[PDB]
Design an enzyme around this catalytic site. Sequence first.
Site, PDB file in Angstrom:
ATOM      1  N   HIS A 168       0.832  -1.202   0.000  1.00 22.51           N
ATOM      2  CA  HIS A 168       0.000   0.000   0.000  1.00 22.51           C
ATOM      3  C   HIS A 168       0.857   1.238   0.000  1.00 22.51           C
ATOM      4  O   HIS A 168       0.395   2.318  -0.357  1.00 22.51           O
ATOM      5  CB  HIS A 168      -0.910  -0.004   1.223  1.00 22.51           C
TER       6      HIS A 168
ATOM      7  N   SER B 157      -0.914  -0.891  -6.098  1.00 23.90           N
ATOM      8  CA  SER B 157      -0.811  -2.044  -6.981  1.00 23.90           C
ATOM      9  C   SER B 157      -0.364  -1.654  -8.376  1.00 23.90           C
ATOM     10  O   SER B 157      -0.429  -0.488  -8.750  1.00 23.90           O
ATOM     11  CB  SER B 157      -2.145  -2.771  -7.048  1.00 23.90           C
TER      12      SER B 157
ATOM     13  N   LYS C 196     -15.838  -7.375  -7.598  1.00 26.96           N
ATOM     14  CA  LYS C 196     -15.005  -8.223  -8.451  1.00 26.96           C
ATOM     15  C   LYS C 196     -14.341  -9.338  -7.651  1.00 26.96           C
ATOM     16  O   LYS C 196     -14.276 -10.485  -8.106  1.00 26.96           O
ATOM     17  CB  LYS C 196     -13.956  -7.370  -9.163  1.00 26.96           C
ATOM     18  N   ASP C 197     -13.872  -9.025  -6.440  1.00 29.59           N
ATOM     19  CA  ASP C 197     -13.303 -10.040  -5.567  1.00 29.59           C
ATOM     20  C   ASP C 197     -14.367 -11.007  -5.075  1.00 29.59           C
ATOM     21  O   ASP C 197     -14.086 -12.193  -4.903  1.00 29.59           O
ATOM     22  CB  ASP C 197     -12.592  -9.373  -4.390  1.00 29.59           C
TER      23      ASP C 197
ATOM     24  N   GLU D 259       3.122 -34.351  -3.200  1.00 29.85           N
ATOM     25  CA  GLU D 259       1.916 -33.920  -3.886  1.00 29.85           C
ATOM     26  C   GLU D 259       2.326 -32.937  -4.999  1.00 29.85           C
ATOM     27  O   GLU D 259       3.459 -32.447  -5.021  1.00 29.85           O
ATOM     28  CB  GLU D 259       0.921 -33.378  -2.847  1.00 29.85           C
TER      29      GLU D 259
HETATM   30  C1  HEM Z   1       0.680 -16.219   0.760  1.00 32.18           C
HETATM   31  C2  HEM Z   1       0.407 -16.106  -0.536  1.00 32.18           C
HETATM   32  C3  HEM Z   1       0.094 -14.784  -1.099  1.00 32.18           C
HETATM   33  C4  HEM Z   1      -1.069 -14.098  -0.976  1.00 32.18           C
HETATM   34  C5  HEM Z   1      -2.292 -14.564  -0.240  1.00 32.18           C
HETATM   35  C6  HEM Z   1      -0.919 -12.877  -1.678  1.00 32.18           C
HETATM   36  C7  HEM Z   1      -1.948 -11.933  -1.733  1.00 32.18           C
HETATM   37  C8  HEM Z   1      -1.827 -10.764  -2.447  1.00 32.18           C
HETATM   38  C9  HEM Z   1      -2.857  -9.827  -2.640  1.00 32.18           C
HETATM   39  C10 HEM Z   1      -4.257  -9.918  -2.102  1.00 32.18           C
HETATM   40  C11 HEM Z   1      -2.358  -8.822  -3.398  1.00 32.18           C
HETATM   41  C12 HEM Z   1      -3.100  -7.601  -3.862  1.00 32.18           C
HETATM   42  C13 HEM Z   1      -4.149  -8.002  -4.904  1.00 32.18           C
HETATM   43  C14 HEM Z   1      -3.549  -8.831  -6.007  1.00 32.18           C
HETATM   44  O1  HEM Z   1      -3.250 -10.030  -5.809  1.00 32.18           O
HETATM   45  O2  HEM Z   1      -3.351  -8.319  -7.130  1.00 32.18           O
HETATM   46  C15 HEM Z   1      -1.019  -9.124  -3.687  1.00 32.18           C
HETATM   47  C16 HEM Z   1      -0.203  -8.316  -4.434  1.00 32.18           C
HETATM   48  C17 HEM Z   1       1.089  -8.704  -4.746  1.00 32.18           C
HETATM   49  N1  HEM Z   1       1.739  -9.824  -4.406  1.00 32.18           N
HETATM   50 FE1  HEM Z   1       1.027 -11.200  -3.363  1.00 32.18          FE
HETATM   51  N2  HEM Z   1       0.302 -12.816  -2.224  1.00 32.18           N
HETATM   52  C18 HEM Z   1       0.982 -13.933  -1.915  1.00 32.18           C
HETATM   53  C19 HEM Z   1       2.277 -14.317  -2.244  1.00 32.18           C
HETATM   54  C20 HEM Z   1       3.099 -13.517  -3.010  1.00 32.18           C
HETATM   55  C21 HEM Z   1       4.417 -13.845  -3.365  1.00 32.18           C
HETATM   56  C22 HEM Z   1       5.130 -15.107  -2.983  1.00 32.18           C
HETATM   57  C23 HEM Z   1       4.924 -12.804  -4.113  1.00 32.18           C
HETATM   58  C24 HEM Z   1       6.273 -12.716  -4.707  1.00 32.18           C
HETATM   59  C25 HEM Z   1       6.706 -13.657  -5.539  1.00 32.18           C
HETATM   60  C26 HEM Z   1       3.882 -11.835  -4.201  1.00 32.18           C
HETATM   61  C27 HEM Z   1       4.025 -10.649  -4.867  1.00 32.18           C
HETATM   62  C28 HEM Z   1       2.974  -9.744  -4.930  1.00 32.18           C
HETATM   63  C29 HEM Z   1       3.128  -8.493  -5.668  1.00 32.18           C
HETATM   64  C30 HEM Z   1       4.355  -8.029  -6.405  1.00 32.18           C
HETATM   65  C31 HEM Z   1       1.966  -7.842  -5.539  1.00 32.18           C
HETATM   66  C32 HEM Z   1       1.610  -6.518  -6.143  1.00 32.18           C
HETATM   67  C33 HEM Z   1       0.935  -6.936  -7.449  1.00 32.18           C
HETATM   68  C34 HEM Z   1       0.528  -5.769  -8.301  1.00 32.18           C
HETATM   69  O3  HEM Z   1      -0.191  -4.872  -7.823  1.00 32.18           O
HETATM   70  O4  HEM Z   1       0.897  -5.717  -9.494  1.00 32.18           O
HETATM   71  N3  HEM Z   1       2.802 -12.257  -3.447  1.00 32.18           N
HETATM   72  N4  HEM Z   1      -0.700 -10.299  -3.063  1.00 32.18           N
END
Ligand code: HEM
Lengths: 403, 189
Positions: free
Chosen positions: B10, B14, B36-37, B80
Amino acid sequence: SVPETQVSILDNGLRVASEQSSHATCTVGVWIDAGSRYETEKNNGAGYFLEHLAFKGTKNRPGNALEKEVESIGAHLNAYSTREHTAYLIKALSKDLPKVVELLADIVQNSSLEDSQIEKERDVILREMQENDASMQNVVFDYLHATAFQGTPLAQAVEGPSENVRRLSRTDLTDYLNRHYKAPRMVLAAAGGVEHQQLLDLAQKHLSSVSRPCRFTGSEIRHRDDALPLAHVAIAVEGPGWANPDNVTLQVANAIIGHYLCQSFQTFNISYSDTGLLGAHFVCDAMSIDDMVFFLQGQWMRLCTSATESEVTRGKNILRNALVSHLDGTTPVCEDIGRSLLTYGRRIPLAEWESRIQEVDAQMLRDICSKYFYDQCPAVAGYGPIEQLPDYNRIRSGMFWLR
Amino acid sequence: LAIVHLLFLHETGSNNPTGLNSDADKIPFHPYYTIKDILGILIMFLILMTLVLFFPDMLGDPDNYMPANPLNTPPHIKPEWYFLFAYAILRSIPNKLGGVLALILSILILALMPFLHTSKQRSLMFRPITQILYWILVANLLILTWIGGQPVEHPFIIIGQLASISYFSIILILMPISGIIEDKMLKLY
Ligand code: HEM
């Protein structure tokens, strides 16, 4: 015992109304049921440009000699145009009553549009518009009219687009003049030290020659320009019209709303023939934008849900004290008289207004406010730094309460 | 850690699929990306309940329905399916240690990913060569998922060895070189 406005329409259709007062100065005007609503997008600035040309000389009084006459008695000459009505009014002394009427006769008929003048008034109008953009609230209310009445003749402005202004010719004007200046659509209104029989005889002598689906649309228009220091926002819903009596109740509500947060709050009830815009136009800093809104919407919903008798009594007193609009002054009354005959077809006396005010209570006020404000799609017009101005879902959700 | 993940985001907001600065066009989240979500939650629940109520054992292994016998070994041992890509890599490297390390790198190579960005454009919406390399990467990730399943015998092994070599070479070498070439094509480099 309100002084009655005696009315004497002519066979041509020229209603001639007048109200006498002690003032030895009298205001005489001509009202015409002709505005930008009667224009068909090919002559969108014809009424405005004719309003510019109407004081530049007639056939009988060529050029500035005409205005020399209205200097000679020390009278004042004014004209204005709205989306529905056009007015040409003179404030003068009582003893100069005949010649003034004769002057008004020239202004409505026998008028002369000089081609030379047409170019000069085009540069005046063009330039003013080129600088009119400066007045924000005018820009915001024009944007509100456009986005609320899209596709209708009520969206287009009184001035028209520069395009038409440049592209206009005597014949076109002549048409608008010969088409929308009919005698049955004309009122000769007089207020102040005038006798009705003398005014009727003068209207018989001169002026006896005059020839004999509106839709609201909820839409978010946003003119973003971040260099401006202040933002102007207008939010409106559809109004009832001229002939619907609950206007009076809405006026009370507007009164109750008054203006409480960010500066420059206000409220309007603009009425046209069975339509209108009822709402508020605040103006403020970047942050207040939303809250004010939030603030403003809350007040509307309070008037739909939780109106009490004390604020209704206060709004009734404010509206009555607003009957001062009628007052006694020649100009205001004359003006009022002018509209009365064009819109209602009669002059509503102040006693009838007082009766319609005193019949308004809190229950019918919240009923009429729920009829016109609750769960309605508004028209929004913003100009300035309006990024924090909420979009249409948030405003539409603020147009009702979950409780 | 997910709360920390949301915070560290934040601060920056995004990203968008064009990869450009979206500050000129931002909308609220409550009425636009909430419904949407909610729709995405409903679709994910549809897929989850058709996985549970109709094919409850298409992703699991049947041999997990036998009790644990230390004396009896299964003829073929798998984790798995989502561990398979890693499994393949581990099996590919001859050295035990090598396998473990490569395996770890398999996941860690991602962390290493922000230091390999050599392009002047953030997203791949306007980058077709790196798009092709990305889909080849998804392709041999699917290949490594398949190989893990296959037993130890020709030619599954060679594919595994190549697929791992191609995976590490596409992530480490091919994408920054392709980004340099793409910057050269737009008269930027
Ligand atoms: C525990 C698993 C994860 C959950 C539940 C999660 C959840 C989220 C959520 C809700 C967002 C904002 C909405 C969206 O997905 O676009 C987000 C954004 C993001 N997540 Fe994750 N995430 C996870 C793992 C990861 C991992 C492992 C990475 C890195 C490899 C990552 C990188 C990002 C990035 C870079 C954003 C910003 C995306 C954008 O706005 O373009 N996340 N994540």
